[PDB]
Design a protein around this ligand. Structure first.
Ligand SMILES: N[C@@H](Cc1c[nH]c2ccccc12)C(=O)O
Ligand SMILES: N[C@@H](Cc1c[nH]c2ccccc12)C(=O)O
Ligand SMILES: N[C@@H](Cc1c[nH]c2ccccc12)C(=O)O
Ligand SMILES: N[C@@H](Cc1c[nH]c2ccccc12)C(=O)O
Ligand SMILES: N[C@@H](Cc1c[nH]c2ccccc12)C(=O)O
Ligand SMILES: N[C@@H](Cc1c[nH]c2ccccc12)C(=O)O
Ligand SMILES: N[C@@H](Cc1c[nH]c2ccccc12)C(=O)O
Ligand SMILES: N[C@@H](Cc1c[nH]c2ccccc12)C(=O)O
Ligand SMILES: N[C@@H](Cc1c[nH]c2ccccc12)C(=O)O
Ligand SMILES: N[C@@H](Cc1c[nH]c2ccccc12)C(=O)O
Ligand SMILES: N[C@@H](Cc1c[nH]c2ccccc12)C(=O)O
Lengths: 67, 68, 69, 68, 69, 69, 68, 68, 68, 69, 68
């Protein structure tokens, strides 16, 4: 199953997981401080991922940056 | 399953999931504020995704941009 | 796990039309896009062909093609 | 499962689906007007596709053009 | 999910002949193409070999080849 | 499943299927005259293919030529 | 299943496994000292990994560096 | 499933199929005259193939040439 | 499964397997003397591998070096 | 399943298949003379292959050459 | 399933299988003299392979050389 790499470029970045299934809501928000990296898969419980805050992101489709 | 990356280039962008199945309707709209990124899969419940508003989108077939 | 098509409307009133899978072929849904909206649409248990009408920039795994209104 | 892209270069381009199975005949003809695009899969019901008329065609093996 | 061949007729009366899969081998269908028409034909449960007669431009996963009439 | 493309470069080329299994024998010989093309799979019944006669051959390993008699 | 390579560039780097499932929490934190390498899979129990401290990281998507 | 192409560069090239299983011996020998081509798979009954005589051979790992 | 290559660049390099499962602990420590090479899979019992000591390592993701 | 290509570069080359399982021993030694090519798979019964004698070898990882005593 | 190629560069090189399973111990040591080549899979019984002595090694990750 595929994954996303997120590197926080500032304190307070949120990596938020969205529920798989008929309904869509946030079930977890992981806080990243500056320089921390999270590598996060899609899973049985998480079919969409939202990033809030400034971070460097890598996926299979290349690099993108949130602000 | 494939996924799409959507980065909102202005406030109020909507990423809209359309129902899988014989019926087609919107089941969810995720609102993105400028500079937020959403990485969203195709799923048992979502077989088409629509984006409204200004955004930079990546998929397996490359970059495309939506404009508001 | 199926393939998908990206459609970006280059004018108002673009229609992305889904054709039914199976022995019966007909249109079952027509999605209206206005200028600059994007639809990323899979082939599905219900949709085995997709017709685009109106001016649009389309990406498939075979590359770019453009429809003209 | 594979698909063919068909872009009509004139009115009345006919995309013809041939039946899968021991018998071969057409079971559907989808006409396209100039500039419309049809992205059609091979399926449980369609194992060969014929294009009549002027059309620009993409498949996994590259581009080909039909002449009407 | 089988492979498919692309056949473009370069003259009228090209024949794309499907041969039967299985222990026995015979022609089960000849699809006749006129000049400029394109047939995209899979290998299937019933067709394990395809013969082209007449002048045609052909694409398969191993490249381009041309039949001559 | 893999296939081979055979284009006859003279009359009377044979494309010969050998039986799959513990027994090996020819079960079919498809005659090609000049300019005809056969695109033939490996199958539940054919696990080896012999070409006799002058032909241009494509497989997934590239181009090979058989030389006639 | 995919894996991530982490080389500690300073002492006390923490590679933290997050639980797979409805619940998300840290179930393990592996401490690496300077110059140690950990190569770590996604698994039945671990569906996200977090690195804290200065490290050089390789994944399928290329190289990235965490900072302390 | 993999296959080899064998082109005979002289008369009487011998393509030898070795039996798959705990035992090894040849179960079939197909002779090729000069210029003939055999395209042969690995199968339930053949798990090694030997070529005797001058032949031009292609496999997934490139070209090799047997000499008589 | 994926495997890692580890070449000891000094004596007493440790290639340590961490248990797969809810619990994470060392189950095995393989000591390599200078110049020895260990080629080691991920497996039913081992879902993370830690290298301590100076070594040259190859993974699908490319080269990395652990240092003493 | 993977296979290795072995071309003998002198008489008397041996390609030795080692048994798959907890037990490791030689179950078969195929003797090759100069110029002959063996294309051998890994199998239910053979999980390692040893080559003794001068030979030119191809595998998915590239060319390697065995040298005889 | 993958394999590794080992060419011995001097006499008495040892290619050592380590047991798959909860337990890790040797199980078999194949001695290669100079110039001999062994091509060995990962298997139900072997999940790690050690090379001791001077040898040229190829894996899917490239060339590496052990030193005695
Ligand atoms: N609960 C939704 C979440 C989702 C995934 N991808 C989306 C795309 C758009 C909107 C919502 C979603 C689902 O599993 O289908
Ligand atoms: N409910 C439709 C939604 C859909 C997916 N792709 C489409 C293409 C065109 C029109 C509708 C669609 C389906 O699951 O098949
Ligand atoms: N209902 C038809 C639709 C179709 C798909 N590809 C086509 C090509 C030509 C004509 C019809 C089709 C099918 O599922 O087979
Ligand atoms: N009914 C035929 C259609 C077909 C597919 N490919 C062909 C090639 C030649 C002739 C007919 C065909 C089949 O399913 O096999
Ligand atoms: N009925 C034969 C047709 C065939 C396929 N490939 C061939 C190659 C040679 C001769 C015959 C064939 C089969 O299914 O096997
Ligand atoms: N009956 C043999 C035919 C064959 C395939 N590949 C071969 C290679 C050599 C000799 C015979 C063969 C089989 O199916 O195994
Ligand atoms: N017992 C843990 C080991 C592990 C794998 N990857 C990790 C990443 C971080 C922390 C622990 C791990 C598991 O199988 O999941
Ligand atoms: N327990 C969560 C952990 C997780 C994986 N990826 C995520 C992305 C965002 C938030 C949480 C996660 C899950 O398996 O789904
Ligand atoms: N009967 C043997 C034939 C064989 C395949 N590859 C080999 C390599 C070496 C020696 C014999 C073999 C087997 O199926 O395993
Ligand atoms: N019987 C052993 C053969 C073997 C394969 N790979 C090896 C590597 C080293 C030593 C022995 C082996 C096994 O199947 O596992
Ligand atoms: N018996 C161990 C062998 C092993 C494979 N990879 C390793 C890495 C480190 C330590 C031991 C191992 C296992 O099957 O898991």
């Amino acid at each position: 199953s595929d994954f996303v790499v997120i590197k926080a470029l500032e304190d307070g970045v949120n990596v938020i997981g969205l529920t798989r299934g008929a309904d869509t809501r946030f079930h977890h928000s992981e806080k990243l401080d500056k320089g921390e990296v999270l590598i996060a898969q899609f899973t049985e419980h998480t079919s969409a991922i939202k990033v809030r805050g400034k971070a460097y992101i890598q996926t299979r489709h290349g690099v993108i940056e949130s602000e």
